Ligand code: HEM
């Protein structure tokens with residue numbers, strides 16, 4: 001077959017291509033190349049060869065096998081954000097990731113997934129009763145900040161539960177993600193011109209220190225406590241492993257940070273896009289309101305309710321399909337392999353353009369938002385919003401629950417209006433790492449009006 005992509009020009013090929021990624025941003029850079037060349041094609045970030053693939057069959061082969069259970073990134077960029085062989089998200093040491101992941105997996109399923117449905121609802125209730133902290137004079141709600149605040153609140157009360165400053169931390173987290181996003185594929189030259197990179201080294205330290213205060217108190221509380229087996233929360237589980245010397249304090253500290261940011265980083269942006277889609281799609285809103293009245297009514301939301309919320313479940317999926325936030329997945333080849341009739345050496349970086357994949361394959365009406373796409377049960381080998389197998393999203397289950405929870409408890413109480421002209425398609429979007437809205441532009445607010 002042989003491998004498609006731009007020409008090697010001795011040092012130039014890898015320089016224009018890396019440049020293209022730094023200029024446009026990973027998201028749009030990937031779409032570019034996919035659109036120009038094949039759905040399977042080669043590029044260069046830093047020195048290293050990297051493939052950018054939207055072929056559903058390649059995606060499936062890659063996520064399924066254990067020998068793609070790695071990601072990649074600037075070592076110096078990762079060391080800076082403290083993800084270099086520490087958390088799980090970009091922990092690329094196979095032996096440390098293999099031993100760390102279990103803690104996340106356990107915390108994000110079973111009993112904790114059941115509490116989460118009832119804790120998302122409470123934390124949103126408490127914040128909808130406090131709308132005065134996010135609403136404009138002309139009645140504009142800052143949906144983004146609201147969603148981040150609750151998300152953080154939920155994550156905290158479930159995984160750490162130490163009193164913190166919601167408002168402050170959300171900003172710090174917001175900065176950290178920006179740092180993470182920037183430094184992730186910066187070439188090494190970047191890390192010499194300091195009055196250029198240490199804008200970020202700041203955001204990182206600010207969050208890292210803010211948390212070191214919380215993990216400090218959680219340690220104090222544990223040392224004395226109430227004899228352990230209350231509900232072993234993520235944070236405890238970790239500290240006790242650290243205490244048995246299964247983990248190092250550095251590792252534990254990063255893990256907690258990674259858990260607290262994951263929700264606000266992605267859920268808020270996802271739900272924000274969803275609320276924007278609900279506004280501009282009135283017939284769908286009725287469907288969801290009916291389904292709510294049928295299944296839940298005026299009752300509190302409980303775990304048993306969530307399986308029956310099928311219309312909503314299909315809205316949620318169709319939203320992530322049509323307007324993804326996490327539209328690309330970074331992986332690394334650990335062994336030699338033929339991948340859809342292509343030679344893939346170990347050490348080859350991979351970007352899985354799962355956003356473009358949800359447009360080009362399977363779906364009846366791939367290029368418009370309709371629950372038509374999910375009218376017939378979807379194979380999942382054709383639809384990967386979270387990924388799967390050894391290294392798929394750790395919260396892939398708890399997320400789906402949380403979104404149902406907070407959508408119900410919102411749409412229950414409020415009709416949601418988009419600002420005059422606005423819709424998701426006409427929003428300034430940064431397409432790099434994640435696909436989030438441009439927050440320097442504006443009219444990203446919404447109007448909450450009661451249902452009755
Ligand atoms: C709701 C929107 C979310 C989306 C679309 C999403 C999607 C993804 C995707 C596509 C990956 C890449 C997995 C792979 O390599 O196949 C991932 C990784 C991950 N996600 Fe999610 N996720 C979401 C929410 C969450 C939440 C709420 C949490 C935790 C509370 C979470 C925790 C993680 C972690 C820890 C990883 C790294 C897994 C690893 O490499 O070990 N995600 N996510």
Ligand SMILES: C[C@]12CCC(=O)C=C1CC[C@@H]1[C@@H]2CC[C@]2(C)C(=O)CC[C@@H]12
Nearest residue numbers: 089261262265266326328329330433434
């Ligand atoms: C879901 C996630 C982790 C939790 C978090 O804090 C925020 C994000 C957003 C970016 C995701 C990332 C997981 C790894 C992903 C899928 C990649 O390989 C490229 C983009 C990136």
